[PDB]
Design an enzyme around this catalytic site. Structure first.
Site, PDB file in Angstrom:
ATOM      1  CB  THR B   1      91.629  87.779  49.074  1.00  0.00           C
ATOM      2  OG1 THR B   1      90.725  86.713  48.760  1.00  0.00           O
ATOM      3  CG2 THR B   1      91.269  89.000  48.254  1.00  0.00           C
ATOM      4  CB  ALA B  49      86.090  89.181  55.482  1.00  0.00           C
TER       5      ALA B  49
END
Lengths: 197, 200, 241, 249, 229, 239, 235, 240, 213
Positions: B1, B49
């Site tokens: 990410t 996440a």
């Protein structure tokens, strides 16, 4: 990885720390403050594993200020040192050891200036001068070389500047800026940051 | 990410990619990694996440309870400290989070960075994720506190684009937000392919 | 000829002869000590109003909070003990936010009222938890909110029973205010008419002459969120009357 | 009818009568006295137990040492007194363990008074039927004398008496005590005077009183109990002085 | 009134009257006498039995807590045994911690702390028994009393039980500090002789002594020899 | 006098009667009436609801525990809600564990135990609510009643609440035909039975009637004010 | 009948033990609070020296934190417990949310504690009412009051304790925007109000001020003497 | 006199009256009898039909506390059902730990001790049930036990509980159960119940019977309806 | 030694629509190299408007289905309404995160019709992070199935090709084809396909044969 240095004197204690907070390799913060004022005339310097530093520092700060509010007088530096040592030592046996290395600096009207040293295992030692971190290995010999028990404060800031520029010369990590402040009978005094560009 | 956030004169610009991977399999290229914690402050998610989503949602409910009880919106500092304490309670149990809580309060623009390790720090510029290191160079060379709003959007877009270019585990599209004193706005969601068409 | 032995009213968990459980009934009598509150449900929305009963001029009027916001969709008006009211309001707020957390949706007014009612029921002490008040909650709440079913007004009492009500009045002048509600109310009335009628009834029951300071007024409409009429809006309507 | 039971019911007019009934108990107790002087602070008490076949094995029946830097004298129920003194010693040593400094006098008094308040408030336990005087030296405020009651309320006194004839003791001390002018010898003489006035016995036996003094010598507090010869000399001096004052008239 | 029944209720005039009632329970108990001699301390009590059928060897009113401590009681027999077991346990805990025999003063402090512990709770009653705890420590004799209240006192000599006031007067008349225990046992049996209302015999009394050797219960033959005078 | 022996459940009376339990049994009489009756293929619950005022909605007197069980309450709504929660959790536990609908008889046994525990101990009061439990299981349609005393019964039909003796006598004289009835005939019989309990001035309406039906093919359904109109229309008039 | 337990409601739904605690508050020494535009002044009467007592031990006014202070009228020991609990809550709130406590937050906490003691039998209500003063982050002055019942209310100015009715009537008459204009005027207003009910002026009042961003200052007895002299002269 | 209020109390004359008041509870109950013979134990209950509305085979006072033992109760039905749950738990625990079916004497002792626990403490009342337990095992034989509300337990060759205990006991006394067999004993149990039933005071009753014995291979079970009808017809004929 | 997980195989697919949603799965259960059974559909009907598909450890799939059914009943009892697809999704996220530290080894897909009437698919990682997606494939053959769905349904990497809203018939054709390919080249997936299509009418179940191994 984080540098703390403290120099006691006749009527003062000088303390400085690096201003770097870092991720793996990226130096997220250039102006991190590792100095926490427990009271008007005592400072706590803390370095160690992340999270543990701020949590323990804040806990001791709030306990000391609660003492102030409840009893109307500040704790002694020695008493604050023994208290934070007790809290750290109790946690060492427990499942949540705070991996923190601290330097406590204070001035007492009765007992004069004091500098205290404690490791993550929660040993406590009063000392004339002390340092924490990998840079301490480089810079302690500077203090052991040029320190005098009667050192004046101008001489002390000069000695500290020598100690830090040695880190600039030789230490592998980049500690470009340092914060400096003095405790005396008047109280904690901020000093100009010793910044090596 | 890759997630990016910087403070400038007219507010805080929050940017992020949209790629989520398991192993080397790109499970989704449309993940929304800027979590709208509230109408007035928002956060980002890097690392796990599930961890980021759950804990930011819990922070959101705490913030709304605070607003109802105290008749005032929580400060960004208080929100960051709450989240930091919550994650620190689970230190060493394997949570992975790196997130930037972003908002205005009485102080001014507010940007913080908090991680599962336990750090909480406030700064002018931050970036979290695998592509942080790549985003940092572009953002640092382009950043100034006095920056036009369009120019700030541009450097955010370009930073995330270069980060996706170099980093394998970051990609998809760049979702961009501007935190403005009334509240946050969602300025753009440009795909990296169109951005490659533009910049090159 | 007077028989006043009672001897069973004292102490909850005692069924008196004829099985009436008088502590709860006395708690239901308790809300009549409270300031009168009034709610009207309409198609355009639900409005809530209450008389503040300011003791002295020095007391800040804003501090008196007899109408509050559980969430944007639901608001409450209360009459009775302010403290246990605060407790139940806290329960309502946390339950709404728990529902948002778990299901990513907004609770219905009936579900929120049931949530607080479950807490009110715990005076019986069936649970072994120490932190539940032995006495019943000496407060009645009016829950007004726009849900999937539209505007809804629910009433809650110290027993924990709850019901929908097109219009209800709680507090001291609930007797008589309810008769005025029954005559004035028709389902078709708009929220403007409902506001005017509720303020008429509150003016009738209130000992002091009605003023923007001594009343609190609120409305939640389908498009809007929970809203409190400001000093100026209150001035406009109380002038219109 | 009865709003005096269970120590948890405010009576109409808002009075807790159980604690007042407990305060009634200390009045029966043997008188205890404390006087503050510039150089020291003393505790003097009347040993109410004057049974012939009793042994003075202990350090003192009424006077207790709580710490290096302070002591206390107790009037009230002896069992509750023993409990409270044990709690006091534990509190002081806990503070010394935590901070590695001696417990401040006011802090120790405040902690025990918090305990005593707690026993009032919760239902089952009775209030402590005890009132005790604390004497100590602390670096912050020097020599200090403190009094406590069953209510959990404390105050700082230059001189005070608790127990039987406490009102007479306080009336005598009010006229006699010289603010800022006392020394330990003069305070001892005043203590003998007020004890002779309060105690029903015409002659203070010197086995019917126990006097202890707290002084700072060589940077260390010393808590000493005046021995029977010393208090015998004191009562002899007081008798001589009072007779000479009598002889002049 | 209500003050009478409750144990956690100070009466008007500040009396915990249930404890006074427990002391009244003590007063009804059989006579017990304690005299502290210079070289020892004697504990004596009457063990008057309802019938010949009773086997005297089965139970004893004088019990050793430790080698150098022993005690006697006046009051409730069951309460006596509860606290004698607790006293023995406390002494052994002291020996485990400090590896020294417990001092008599410390033991009486601990058992009095237990007795006080019981008075506070409403669900329990005070111990309806008082004790005379005698010991020899540091080459010195000791005698103590511990009441139901949880208070303790140090007596040169004292008596509990029936006619304790008259026994105490007889003692203060007869007591001399210079007494050796050989005389003190005689004085103790005389103090009890005041209050039997029966012809005392070796069985009807139980007596024990402490000294540098330690506590012991002198046998029926021994007490017969002393009774012969 | 005998004001004593009435204070608590834990005190027996000199003639072997626990008066607090009986005082709790009086509680069911306070509530609005309810009637339940069954056929070979169906079980029905019908209720008379009450309203605090004209503006207020009528209270909920029939509650669904599960697809195969539902209840109707007479007595304290608080105790009703609590016991309904307990029953719902028991049925959910049975479905989770064994993947079968809980037997209705076993459920009322659990209710009886839970209700019995207050009566014997000091503390919590007896559950002052009377429930009619109706459900379909493999054995067949079932109707039970539970008293504030933990004793429970199995019934061909039953009525609880205020003025329920009239409904009981109507049910008893008409009981024989119930077993072979259609669901429409059965609900009509129950509606007439509760109509007996009403005051003479009052009459059945769409508003104050609620009907609860469960059967082999029908899960428990509460037919509300609008939905009771098909069942109500058949009824003729007061006699 | 219905006044022996906190839990039991009376017929007509009066909980009477909490009323009795509110009555117990009335016995206590007077306290007064007033909100100036830039000052909040908290004044408390002093019962008596007794001539062998040390005044420092007895102080009704106390600082919960840097930005909040309280004064109490009621049971002194209960006040001490509540003050300590609020202080630890203040430091804990700073620990938790890295921000200083708001005056409404701390008065809410104190009220919740008092409420917690009222709700359950086996515990008696704290027999105190308090006057909490502080400056919020915006800098607005705040004055709140609490009672044994657990309700809290903001007041422009208020009094608690004995003679509260008389002094608050005086304050309803006297208080206005004009009086709050000057800090000295605020101090003089509260001093006159306490003078309305007190045996002697300077000896028997202990007064304190909080400024916008300064710690609590207990005014010296000489300063109080000067202010009463200015008040006395103007008459 | 406040002595009778609680079971913790004693009367000045040494009587715990709450327990006796609880013993008076069972006398309110309709009668139930159990008779032990050579083959096994037969139980019978006079279950009064309070209303026609109530279903048959409801309000059962005969419970199966384990496969090899059955329980018949008189007194409060709630307390009785709870005691039956306790007995079933005790039997299951015995099987789980010791590996075999519980002896009836031991089961009676354990449930009796559980009952006796309640007479001591003030917080909780004595049980309001008196119940009979019966089993047959080839080793132990036929056993019938009765437990009062006190927790007293004894073995009875024949036993009765409830309202008509005394009359039922004399009728049982003139029976000679020891020689007899179960299929006759069911008929005589029906006779005794029909005798003691009071038609004026009690409107109607449905005889509820059970037995355990070798004929069941040591399983307590409800009587087959044919045998029930035969016994009931015999009882009506003998009643005259 | 004891391993609390085993990968029981299977793949799940879900594809949304303007007015419909489809959820499809294999019906094979396979431990190691052996086939436990050839008829074990992974799709479960939660509500009229919702279907859940679960793949991974079968014990966790079973317990999670039971938990979701029970909590659906509980929501119905409390709120007097049926759970929406989004509500079920959030509840499932919380349930999965409850065991962050001893996780459910399941890949879940929720497919249903939203309140507006459109089709919605919610896709979950094993630890409960969830996202609304137009289509997704889960389980062993996610890697194989999802690219073709991305190309055909999402029109990704296709130039000068018009974008058409997906239809029920085209969707079912695509589902059958992709599962045939996964049957060919994935060992775990085969031997049947259950297609569960949800519309305003309700769930409709069609089964089509896939090649036995």
């Amino acid at each position: 990885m984080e540098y703390l240095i403290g120099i006691q004197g006749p009527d003062y204690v000088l303390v400085a720390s690096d201003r770097v907070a870092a991720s793996n390799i990226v130096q997220m913060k250039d102006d991190h403050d590792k100095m926490f004022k427990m009271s008007e005339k005592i400072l706590l310097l803390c370095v160690g594993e992340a999270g543990d530093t701020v949590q323990f520092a804040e806990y001791i700060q709030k306990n000391v200020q609660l003492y102030k509010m409840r009893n109307g007088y500040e704790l002694s530096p020695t008493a604050a040192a023994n208290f934070t040592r007790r809290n750290l030592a109790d946690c060492l046996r427990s499942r949540t050891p705070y991996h923190v290395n601290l330097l406590l600096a204070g001035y007492d009207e009765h007992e004069g200036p004091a500098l205290y040293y404690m490791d993550y295992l929660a040993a406590l030692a009063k000392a004339p001068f002390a340092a924490h971190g990998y840079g301490a290995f480089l810079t302690l010999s500077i203090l052991d070389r040029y320190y005098t028990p009667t050192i004046s404060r101008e001489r002390a800031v000069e000695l500290l500047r020598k100690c830090l520029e040695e880190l600039q010369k030789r230490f592998i990590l980049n500690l470009p800026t340092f914060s400096v402040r003095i405790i005396d009978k008047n109280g904690i005094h901020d000093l100009d940051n010793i910044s090596f560009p | 990410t890759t997630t990016l956030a910087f403070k400038f004169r007219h507010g805080v610009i929050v940017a992020a990619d949209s790629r989520a991977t398991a192993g080397a399999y790109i499970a989704s290229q449309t993940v929304k990694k800027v979590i709208e914690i509230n109408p007035y402050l928002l956060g980002t998610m890097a690392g796990g996440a599930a961890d980021c989503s759950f804990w930011e949602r819990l922070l959101a409910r705490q913030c709304r309870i605070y607003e109802l009880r105290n008749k005032e919106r929580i400060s960004v500092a208080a929100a960051s400290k709450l989240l930091a304490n919550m994650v620190y309670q689970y230190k060493g149990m394997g949570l992975s989070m790196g997130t930037m809580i972003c908002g205005w309060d009485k102080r001014g623009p507010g940007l913080y960075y908090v991680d599962s390790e336990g750090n909480r720090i406030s700064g002018a510029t931050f970036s979290v994720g695998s592509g942080s290191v790549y985003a940092y160079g572009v953002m640092d060379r382009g950043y100034s506190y006095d920056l036009e709003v369009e120019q700030a959007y541009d450097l955010a877009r370009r930073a995330i684009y270069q980060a996706t270019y170099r980093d394998a585990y970051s990609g998809g599209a760049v979702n961009l937000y501007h935190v403005r004193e009334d509240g946050w706005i969602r300025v753009s969601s440009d795909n990296v392919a169109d951005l490659h068409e533009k910049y090159s | 000829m007077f028989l006043t032995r009672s001897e069973y009213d004292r102490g909850v968990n005692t069924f008196s002869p004829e099985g009436r459980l008088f502590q709860v009934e006395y708690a239901i009598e308790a809300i009549k000590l409270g300031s009168t509150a009034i709610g009207i449900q309409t198609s355009e929305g639900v409005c809530l109003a209450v008389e503040k009963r300011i003791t002295s001029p020095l007391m800040e009027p804003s501090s008196i909070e007899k109408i509050v916001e559980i969430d944007a969709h639901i608001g409450c008006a209360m009459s009775g003990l302010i403290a246990d009211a605060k407790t139940l309001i806290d329960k309502a707020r946390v339950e709404t936010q728990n529902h948002w957390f778990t299901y990513n949706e907004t609770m219905t007014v009936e579900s929120v009222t049931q949530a607080v009612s479950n807490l009110a029921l715990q005076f019986g002490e069936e649970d072994a938890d120490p932190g539940a008040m032995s006495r019943p909650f000496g407060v009645a709440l009016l829950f007004g909110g726009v849900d999937e079913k539209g505007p809804q007004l629910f009433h809650m009492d110290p027993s924990g029973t709850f019901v929908q009500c097109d219009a209800r009045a709680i507090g001291s002048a609930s007797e008589g205010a309810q008769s005025s509600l029954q005559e004035v109310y028709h389902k078709s009335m708009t929220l403007k008419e409902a506001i005017k009628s509720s303020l008429i009834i509150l003016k009738q029951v209130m000992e002091e002459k009605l003023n923007a300071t001594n009343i609190e007024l609120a409305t939640v409409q389908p498009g809007q969120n929970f809203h409190m009429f400001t000093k100026e809006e209150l001035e406009e309507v109380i002038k219109d009357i | 009818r009865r709003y005096d039971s269970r120590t948890t019911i405010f009576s109409p007019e808002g009075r807790l009568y159980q604690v007042e009934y407990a305060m009634e108990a200390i009045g029966h107790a043997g008188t205890c006295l404390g006087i503050l002087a510039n150089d020291g602070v003393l505790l003097a008490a009347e040993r109410r137990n004057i049974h012939k076949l009793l042994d003075e094995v202990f350090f003192s029946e009424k006077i207790y040492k709580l710490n290096e830097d302070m002591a206390c004298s107790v009037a009230g129920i002896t069992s509750d007194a023993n409990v409270l003194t044990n709690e006091l010693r534990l509190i002081a040593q806990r503070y010394l363990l935590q901070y590695q400094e001696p417990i401040p006098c006011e802090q120790l008094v405040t902690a025990l008074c918090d305990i005593k308040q707690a026993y009032t408030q919760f239902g089952g336990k009775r209030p402590f039927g005890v009132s005790l005087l604390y004497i100590g030296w602390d670096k912050h405020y020097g020599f200090q004398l403190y009094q406590s009651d069953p209510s959990g309320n404390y105050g700082g006194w230059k001189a005070t008496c608790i127990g039987n004839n406490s009102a007479a003791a306080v009336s005598m001390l009010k006229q006699d005590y010289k603010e800022g002018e006392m020394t330990l010898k003069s305070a001892l003489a005043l203590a003998i005077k007020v004890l002779n006035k309060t105690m029903d016995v015409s002659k203070l036996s010197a086995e019917k009183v126990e006097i202890a003094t707290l002084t700072r010598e060589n940077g260390k507090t010393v808590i000493r109990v005046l021995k029977q010869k010393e208090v015998e000399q004191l009562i002899k001096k007081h008798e001589e002085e009072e007779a000479k004052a009598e002889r002049e008239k | 009134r209500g003050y009478s029944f409750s144990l956690t209720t100070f009466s008007p005039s500040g009396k915990l009257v249930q404890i006074e009632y427990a002391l009244a329970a003590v007063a009804g108990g059989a006579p017990s006498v304690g005299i502290k001699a210079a070289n020892g301390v004697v504990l004596a009590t009457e063990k008057k039995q309802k019938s010949i059928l009773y086997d005297e060897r089965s139970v004893h009113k004088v019990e050793p807590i430790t080698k150098h401590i022993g005690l006697v009681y006046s009051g409730m027999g069951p309460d006596y045994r509860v606290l004698v077991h607790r006293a023995r346990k406390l002494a052994q805990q002291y020996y485990l911690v400090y590896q020294e025999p417990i001092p008599t003063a410390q033991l009486v402090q601990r058992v009095a702390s237990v007795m006080q512990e019981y008075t506070q709770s409403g669900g329990v009653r005070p111990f309806g028994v008082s004790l005379l705890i005698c010991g020899w420590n540091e080459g010195r004799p000791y005698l103590f009393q511990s009441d139901p209240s949880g208070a303790y006192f140090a007596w040169k000599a004292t008596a509990m039980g029936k006619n304790y006031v008259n026994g105490k007067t007889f003692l203060e008349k007869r007591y001399n500090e210079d007494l050796e225990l050989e005389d003190a046992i005689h004085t103790a049996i005389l103090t009890l002789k005041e209050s039997f209302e029966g012809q005392m015999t070796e069985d009807n009394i139980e007596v024990g002594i402490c000294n540098e050797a330690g506590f012991r219960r002198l046998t029926p033959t021994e007490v017969k020899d002393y009774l012969a005078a | 006098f005998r004001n004593q022996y009435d204070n608590d459940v834990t005190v027996w009376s000199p003639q072997g009667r626990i008066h607090q339990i009986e005082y709790a049994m009086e509680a069911v009489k306070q509530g609005s009436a309810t009637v339940g009756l069954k056929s070979k293929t169906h079980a029905v619950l019908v209720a008379l609801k009450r309203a605090q005022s004209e503006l207020a909605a009528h209270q909920k007197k029939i509650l669904h525990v599960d697809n195969h069980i539902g209840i109707s309450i007479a007595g304290l709504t608080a105790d009703a809600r609590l016991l309904c929660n307990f029953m719902r959790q028991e049925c959910l536990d049975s479905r989770f564990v064994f993947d079968r609908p809980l037997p209705v008889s076993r459920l009322v046994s659990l209710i009886g135990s839970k209700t019995q525990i207050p009566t014997q101990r000091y503390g919590r009061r007896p559950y002052g609510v009377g429930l009619l439990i109706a459900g379909y299981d493999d054995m067949g349609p079932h109707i039970f009643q539970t008293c504030p005393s933990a004793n429970y019964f199995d019934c061909r039909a039953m009525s609880i609440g205020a003025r329920s003796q009239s409904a009981r006598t109507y049910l008893e004289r008409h009981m024989s035909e119930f077993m072979e009835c259609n669901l429409n005939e059965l609900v009509k019989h129950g509606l007439r039975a509760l109509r007996e309990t009403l005051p003479a001035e009052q009459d059945l309406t769409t508003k104050n009637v609620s009907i609860g039906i469960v059967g082999k093919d029908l899960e428990f359904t509460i037919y509300d004010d609008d939905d009771v109109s098909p069942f109500l229309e058949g009824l003729e008039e007061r006699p | 009948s219905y006044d022996r337990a906190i839990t039991v409601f009376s017929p007509d739904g009066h909980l009477f033990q909490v009323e009795y605690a509110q009555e117990a508050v009335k016995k206590g020494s007077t306290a007064v609070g007033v909100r100036g535009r830039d000052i909040v002044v908290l004044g408390v009467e002093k019962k008596s020296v007794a001539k062998l007592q040390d005044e420092r031990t007895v102080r009704k006014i106390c600082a919960l934190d840097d930005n909040v202070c309280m004064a109490f009228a009621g049971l002194t020991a209960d006040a001490r417990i509540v003050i300590n609990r609020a202080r630890v809550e203040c430091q804990s709130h700073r620990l938790t949310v890295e921000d200083p406590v708001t005056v409404e937050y701390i008065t809410r906490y104190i009220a919740s504690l008092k409420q917690r003691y009222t709700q359950s039998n086996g515990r008696r209500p704290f027999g105190i009412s308090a006057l909490i003063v502080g400056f919020d982050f915006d800098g607005t002055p705040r004055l709140y009051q609490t009672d044994p019942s657990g309700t809290y209310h903001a007041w422009k100015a208020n009094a608690i304790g004995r003679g509260a009715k008389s002094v608050r009537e005086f304050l309803e008459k006297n208080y206005t925007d004009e009086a709050i204009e000057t800090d000295d005027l605020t101090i003089k207003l509260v001093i006159k109000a306490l003078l309305e009910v007190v045996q002697s002026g300077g000896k028997n009042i202990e007064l304190a001020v909080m400024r916008r961003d300064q710690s609590l200052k207990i005014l010296n007895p000489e300063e109080i003497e000067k202010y009463v002299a200015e008040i006395e002269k103007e008459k | 006199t406040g002595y009778d209020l609680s079971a913790s109390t004693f009367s000045p004359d040494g009587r715990v009256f709450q327990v006796e008041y609880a013993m008076k509870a069972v006398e309110n109950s309709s009668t139930a009898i159990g008779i032990r013979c050579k083959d096994g134990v037969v139980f019978g209950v006079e279950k009064l039909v309070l209303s026609k509305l109530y279903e048959e085979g409801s309000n059962k006072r005969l419970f199966n506390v384990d496969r090899h033992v059955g329980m018949a109760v008189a007194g409060l039905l709630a307390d009785a059902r709870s005691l039956a749950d306790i007995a079933r738990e005790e039997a299951s625990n015995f099987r789980s730990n010791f590996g075999y079916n519980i002896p009836l004497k031991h089961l009676a002792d354990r449930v009796a001790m559980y009952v006796h626990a309640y007479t001591l403490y003030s917080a909780v009342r004595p049980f309001g049930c008196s119940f009979m337990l019966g089993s047959y095992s080839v080793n132990d034989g036929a056993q019938l036990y009765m437990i009062d509300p006190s927790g007293v337990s004894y073995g009875y060759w024949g036993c009765a509980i409830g309202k008509a205990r005394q009359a039922a006991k004399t009728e049982i006394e003139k029976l000679q159960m020891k020689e007899m067999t179960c299929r006759d004993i069911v008929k005589e149990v029906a006779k005794i119940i029909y005798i003691v039933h009071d038609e004026v005071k009690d409107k109607a009753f449905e005889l509820e019977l059970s037995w355990v014995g070798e004929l069941t291979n040591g399983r307590h079970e409800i009587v087959p309806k044919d045998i029930r009808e035969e016994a009931e017809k015999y009882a009506k004929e003998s009643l005259k | 030694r004891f391993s609390p997980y085993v990968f029981n195989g299977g793949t799940i697919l879900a594809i949304a629509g303007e007015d419909f949603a489809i959820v499809a799965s294999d019906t094979r259960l396979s431990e190691g190299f052996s086939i436990h059974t050839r008829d074990s559909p992974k799709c479960y009907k939660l509500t009229d408007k919702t279907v859940i598909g679960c793949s991974g450890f079968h014990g966790d799939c079973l317990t999670l289905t039971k938990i979701i059914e029970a909590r659906l009943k509980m929501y119905k009892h409390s709120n007097n309404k049926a759970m929406t697809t989004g509500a079920i999704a959030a509840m499932l996220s919380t349930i999965l995160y409850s065991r962050r530290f001893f996780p459910y080894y399941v890949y879940n897909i929720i497919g249903g019709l939203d309140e507006e009437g459109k089709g919605a698919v919610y896709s979950f990682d094993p630890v409960g992070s969830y996202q609304r997606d137009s289509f997704k494939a889960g389980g062993s053959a996610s890697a194989m199935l999802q690219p073709l769905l991305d190309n055909q349904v999402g029109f990704k990497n296709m130039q000068n090709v018009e974008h058409v809203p997906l239809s029920l018939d085209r969707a079912m054709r695509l589902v059958k084809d992709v599962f045939i390919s996964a049957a060919e080249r994935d060992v775990y997936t085969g031997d049947a396909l259950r297609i569960c299509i949800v519309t305003k009418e309700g769930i409709r179940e069609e089964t089509v044969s896939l090649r036995k191994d």
